[PDB]
Design a protein around this ligand. Structure first.
Ligand SMILES: CCCCCCCCCCCCCCCCCC(=O)OC[C@H](COP(=O)(O)OCCN)OC(=O)CCCCCCCCCCCCCCCCC
Ligand code: SF4
Ligand code: SF4
Lengths: 120, 190, 233, 239, 181, 123, 58
């Protein structure tokens, strides 16, 4: 299991989000899981997979290279490290749903010719 | 450097994480002083004193209808139809006022006067539809319809609030001097 | 732009009022900020988390109270909000008391901006100088043929907007106010929907107010700051 | 040192300019680099969900994604939840009645990403009998907006927990923002003395609505405009 | 600290004089607070209907817009130079993927180029096949970033927040309201 | 969260006609059951059998509608109406809109053939 | 009960001098016994009327 969001303890400035005890390992665990889900259920050609792989690898390199939370969040550039953990969890869930939805296919519903005509 | 799903602007500002709240034991004030404030209601007495200070200041009230609040040249009250100094009406039935009125308050009819002039034969304003926006006054190219600074014309039935041509001309005749004041004051700004 | 230029003696009067609005604020704050009954009625009442604030569509103080520093005046600098200096207050607990503090400090920031504009008001026109959009000054309209034609057409037919659509939002005092207008190339809009912040707030009422007491519901309605012209249009 | 001798501002020397200089600039020019960025971003999104995105449009700083009604849940989830997008705030939901299309209504979603300081718009289509999937499961705020869209237009939102009129009177028949609904409605109310209650009656106006739209211009007013597309998004010409 | 207290005699409000002034200063919570009443000889005088500036006002204008000799209206007619709305469907994005772009072409000349444009505009290649044939160079340069990362949601004016602490803040340390600049 | 209200049913378009007729008959039963509640709430002069008669007429009006989507929409609107009535959201004024017949005779002249319609310019 | 306790002191305050230091002690004991019940009321909180973490199974 991974602790994603602490809902009590020390407030950090954003209501409902409290200080995470051990954030870096939770980030690492979530990044491993999302990488694994991409590699086992996403075609290697899909741009979705390529993008998310590169992004997750980048963030995981940053978290492993750096021990201090402030330095990590400065290098990630996406909020406090608690918010970063929540982002990683959310990307992970999105990847698992994308496996079932299969967006890499061809588009199933084509629009009618009249569908997107405006007054120009 | 290079960001992934983020940017320098999305990175937390310096000091975004708040300092941990202090416990009771790390308090500067002794328990006795805090209890003095607690039991004697210090800030409540400060509030009461601020309230009492107002009691000795000059009030703001004015004694209507013997005094009146400020009124400016631009004020928008009841409507009135103006004349030329020669006493000929200024409205030439161009009906721009009818076309711009956002509430469709204005109803106008026109035809060639017996002397050949283009004049109105019916000019009504429904004062219960009007929103007193003053577009009709900006529109008219001869300053014929204007809005007086008069607000005291409340009526006891609604039928008195349906102004016809005769009423609006009578208002213009009655308020011409004040209309001239407002015009002399604001015409350069129109 | 604006319909008419400022009257001649307005900047001085605004400044004269601005010299004493600070005290007028301090007196309200004397009655309210530290009163323990006020804090009893407002602390930890109507608490909203940051994430639920974003999820519910809340904006303005209702969102800045929960710790998120978002302000359209700073984020999407519109008008002269980039030429003036001001700060943005952000709460941390997301309760009625933080929102009250936020509003009380927005008073001060507004006073600062008003003073800056009183000091830096430039000269020039106040409306766009193309008489195909805004009407010409009446001294031209009564002497010039082109100006008279443009005045006639602007007040009878109106200007024609190029076709397209836009969603434009500003930081209204109650939060984010926006409009989604659809133009068909003609003089009359094809569609105009107004996004009123009060609508989203009152929508979030049932989530916020669950588990509170009836007087706390009154205080919550107060902090949502609803007008109900906004709510239903 | 007192208010009786406070200095008279009214007699202070005011600033005076002789000529005001305001350069002529097209206001769309400030958006050029950002329009290029939005184009790149939209290209990425289409490539990422080719099964769903039927197309996009870009106008100054507003990006629109066109999707079929079945694609709404996946695309909204991707927007809300992907790290590079994070469109956490629902702003509004609405419909626009196009009576020429086979599918009358087009449903519009605006989203806001406080993380990235960016907005996006997503469109779908629907008809008077085909519903759209409700996004209340994703965004709580969409509840009331979808009740408003239904009330005004009649568009159904499949999966909405409590879908009912929000604005119109109780027992109102008709969806007012439909282009075929008349301005003044079909009915009005008054107090009926015989029945001692507010009754509904066919509409009868004392003054009839004067539609001044008959005076629309007989000359095309604006023309074609100009295209602000970046050169990296225009098809190449052979040679 | 700018915006700090200013004394009551620099505020345009009536106040008190004589012995009552000393009484007020002795008995006031904050001696520098004004009473709220505007000074009658100073405030809103002369009245708006009797300003001398009305008889000198002229319509304001700005150069070069007011010039009588060098401005053709069509050079400054911004309404009709409005940006068109650019609609891109999957066929157009395809065409961009295969044939490249006007800025950086990947197309042959003569009939070959026109026929390539044609058969993409007919449906010869789908979007998914387009992406599959797409090389590493084109994917990284023209769909993702040169580093292979996806593009972040663009912002028109990036805002860098700073937090003001200490004496320059609005509230003191205790209160749960911080100052962002 | 924002939770549903009393007698709220999530919107679901039935994929098959039979599964829709099941819901339709349930809704009809709910209306018949609620009739006395409606008679108490809205202080009606008329009788419960007349409420039930009116409900039967309302359900009758769409007895021959074929296309499934239209039936789905009609059912959804009927349920919205039921929820409106049973929760006393509606007032007496709007409720009596449903009941135009129980008001008294409006006048002596309700034309039926061409000559009476013609005399009143309604031919 | 509390009303009865308060009104049971009326005879005491009307006879304080006559009961001297004796009645004094008796009424202290009476008051302390009642104070015990008041303590029970306070500690039982008699008149007074989502914090889980988010865990993902990776
Ligand atoms: C240091 C050693 C002292 C030894 C003991 C002292 C002997 C007795 C002291 C005399 C005064 C005692 C009575 C008042 C005590 C005030 C206690 C209090 O503050 O009540 C707090 C109560 C909520 O309780 P609590 O939870 O403890 O507050 C913390 C909230 N986070 O919330 C409240 O009830 C708010 C307080 C109620 C105030 C009522 C105000 C109504 C009338 C105002 C009276 C002011 C005087 C008016 C006269 C005009 C002025 C001349
Ligand atoms: S004030 Fe406005 S509503 Fe009234 S007549 Fe003039 S334009 Fe019409
Ligand atoms: S706009 Fe003025 S001149 Fe023209 S019809 Fe109206 S009142 Fe008369």
């Amino acid at each position: 299991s991974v602790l994603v969001q602490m809902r009590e303890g020390t407030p950090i400035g954003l209501t409902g989000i409290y200080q995470h005890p051990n954030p870096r390992p939770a980030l690492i665990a979530l990044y491993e899981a999302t990488l694994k889900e991409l590699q086992d259920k996403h075609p290697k050609d899909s741009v979705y997979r390529q993008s998310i792989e590169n992004l997750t690898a980048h963030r995981k390199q940053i978290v492993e290279d750096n021990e201090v939370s402030e330095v990590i969040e400065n290098k990630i550039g996406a909020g406090l490290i608690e918010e970063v953990v929540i982002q990683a969890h959310e990307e992970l869930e999105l990847a698992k749903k994308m496996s079932e939805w299969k967006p890499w296919e061809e588009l199933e519903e084509k629009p009618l010719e009249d569908q997107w005509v405006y007054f120009n | 450097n290079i960001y992934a799903g983020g940017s320098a602007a999305a990175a937390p500002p310096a000091g975004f994480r708040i300092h941990r709240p202090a416990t009771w034991e790390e308090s500067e004030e002794g328990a006795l002083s805090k209890a003095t404030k607690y039991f004697l209601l210090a800030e409540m007495f400060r509030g009461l004193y601020v309230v009492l200070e107002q009691f000795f200041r000059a009030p703001y009230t004015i004694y209507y209808p013997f005094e009146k609040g400020p009124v400016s040249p631009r004020f928008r009250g009841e409507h009135a139809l103006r004349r030329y100094p020669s006493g000929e009406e200024r409205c030439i039935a161009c009906k721009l006022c009818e076309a711009i009125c956002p509430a469709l308050a204005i109803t106008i009819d026109a035809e060639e006067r017996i002397d050949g002039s283009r004049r109105t034969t019916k000019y009504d304003i429904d004062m219960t539809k009007c929103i007193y926006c003053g577009y009709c006054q900006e529109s008219c190219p001869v300053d014929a319809i204007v809005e007086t600074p008069n607000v005291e014309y409340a009526t006891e039935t609604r039928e008195e609030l349906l102004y016809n041509k005769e009423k609006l001309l009578a208002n213009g005749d009655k308020w011409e001097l004040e209309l001239q004041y407002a015009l002399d004051a604001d015409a350069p700004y129109r | 732009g604006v319909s008419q230029d400022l009257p001649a003696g307005l900047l001085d009067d605004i400044y004269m009022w601005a010299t004493q609005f600070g005290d007028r604020l301090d007196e309200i704050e004397e009655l309210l900020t530290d009163n323990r009954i006020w804090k009893l009625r407002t602390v930890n009442i109507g608490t909203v988390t940051a994430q639920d604030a974003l999820n519910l569509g809340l904006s303005g103080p209702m969102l800045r109270g929960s710790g998120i520093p978002f302000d359209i005046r700073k984020n999407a600098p519109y008008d002269a909000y980039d030429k003036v200096d001001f700060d943005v207050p952000v709460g941390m607990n997301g309760d009625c008391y933080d929102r009250y503090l936020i509003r009380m400090a927005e008073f001060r920031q507004s006073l600062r901006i008003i003073e800056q504009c009183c000091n830096d008001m430039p000269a020039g026109a106040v409306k766009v100088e193309d008489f195909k959009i805004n009407s010409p000054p009446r001294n031209l309209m009564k002497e010039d043929m082109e100006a008279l034609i443009h005045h006639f057409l602007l007040y009878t037919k109106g200007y024609s907007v190029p076709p397209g659509e836009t969603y434009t939002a500003i930081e209204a005092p109650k939060g984010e106010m926006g409009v989604y207008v659809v133009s068909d190339g003609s003089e009359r809009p094809y569609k105009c929907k107004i996004r009123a912040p009060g609508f989203a707030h009152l929508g979030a009422f049932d989530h916020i107010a669950r588990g509170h007491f009836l007087p706390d519901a009154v205080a919550i309605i107060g902090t949502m700051d609803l007008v109900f012209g906004e709510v239903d249009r | 040192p007192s208010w009786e001798n406070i200095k008279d501002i009214r007699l202070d020397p005011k600033v005076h300019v002789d000529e005001v200089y305001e350069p002529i600039v097209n206001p769309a020019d400030r958006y050029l680099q950002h329009v290029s960025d939005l184009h790149q971003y939209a290209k990425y999104i289409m490539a990422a969900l080719p099964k769903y995105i039927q197309g996009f449009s870009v106008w100054k700083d507003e990006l629109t994604l066109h999707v079929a009604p079945s694609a709404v849940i996946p695309v909204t989830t991707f927007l809300r939840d992907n790290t590079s997008t994070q469109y956490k705030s629902i702003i509004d939901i609405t419909a626009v009645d196009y009576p020429s299309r086979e599918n009358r209504f087009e449903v519009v979603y605006n989203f806001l990403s406080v993380r990235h300081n960016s907005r996006i718009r997503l469109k779908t289509y629907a008809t008077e009998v085909t519903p759209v999937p409700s996004i209340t499961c994703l965004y709580e705020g969409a509840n009331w907006f979808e009740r408003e869209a239904y009330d005004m237009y009649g568009v159904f939102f499949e999966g909405h927990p409590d879908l009912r009129r929000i604005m119109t009177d109780y027992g109102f028949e008709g969806h007012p923002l439909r282009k075929d609904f008349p301005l003044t409605g079909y009915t009005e109310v008054r107090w009926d003395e015989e029945k001692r209650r507010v009754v509904y009656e066919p509409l009868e106006l004392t003054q009839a609505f004067r539609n001044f739209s008959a005076g629309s211009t007989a000359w095309e007013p604006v023309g074609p405009g100009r295209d602000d597309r970046p050169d990296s998004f225009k098809l190449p010409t052979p040679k | 600290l700018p915006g700090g207290p200013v004394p009551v005699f620099k505020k345009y409000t009536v106040g008190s004089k004589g012995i009552w002034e000393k009484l007020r200063v002795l008995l006031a919570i904050a001696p520098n607070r004004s009473t709220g009443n505007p000074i009658v000889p100073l405030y809103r005088v002369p009245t708006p209907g009797s300003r001398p500036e009305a008889n000198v006002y002229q319509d304001p204008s700005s150069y070069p817009t007011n010039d009588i000799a060098e401005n053709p209206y069509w050079k400054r007619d911004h309404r009709r130079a409005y940006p068109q709305t650019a609609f891109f469907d999957q066929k157009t994005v395809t065409g961009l993927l295969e044939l490249g772009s006007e800025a950086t072409p990947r197309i042959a000349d003569g009939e070959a180029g026109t026929k390539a444009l044609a058969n993409i505009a007919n449906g010869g290649v789908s979007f998914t096949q387009a992406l599959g044939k797409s090389s590493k160079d084109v994917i990284y340069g023209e769909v993702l970033t040169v580093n292979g990362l996806p593009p972040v949601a663009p912002t028109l004016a990036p805002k860098q927040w700073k937090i003001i602490e200490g004496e320059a803040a609005i509230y003191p340390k205790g209160y749960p309201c911080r100052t962002f600049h | 969260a924002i939770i549903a209200t009393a007698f709220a049913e999530t919107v679901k378009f039935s994929g098959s006609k039979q599964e829709l007729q099941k819901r339709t008959l349930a809704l009809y039963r709910q209306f018949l059951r609620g009739a006395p509640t409606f008679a108490d709430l809205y202080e009606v002069q008329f009788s419960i059998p007349t409420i039930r008669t009116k409900i039967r007429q309302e359900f009758e009006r769409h007895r021959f509608v074929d296309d499934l989507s239209i039936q789905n929409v009609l059912y959804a609107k009927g349920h919205m109406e039921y929820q409106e009535c049973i929760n006393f959201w509606k007032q007496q004024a709007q409720f009596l809109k449903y009941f135009p017949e129980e008001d008294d005779i409006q006048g002596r002249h309700q034309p039926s053939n061409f000559v009476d319609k013609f005399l009143k310019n309604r031919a | 009960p509390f009303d009865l306790e308060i009104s049971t002191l009326l005879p005491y305050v009307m006879s304080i001098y006559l009961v001297s230091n004796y009645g004094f002690t008796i009424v202290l004991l009476f008051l302390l016994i009642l104070i015990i019940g008041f303590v029970y009321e306070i500690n039982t909180n008699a008149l007074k009327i989502n914090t889980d973490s988010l865990i993902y199974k990776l």
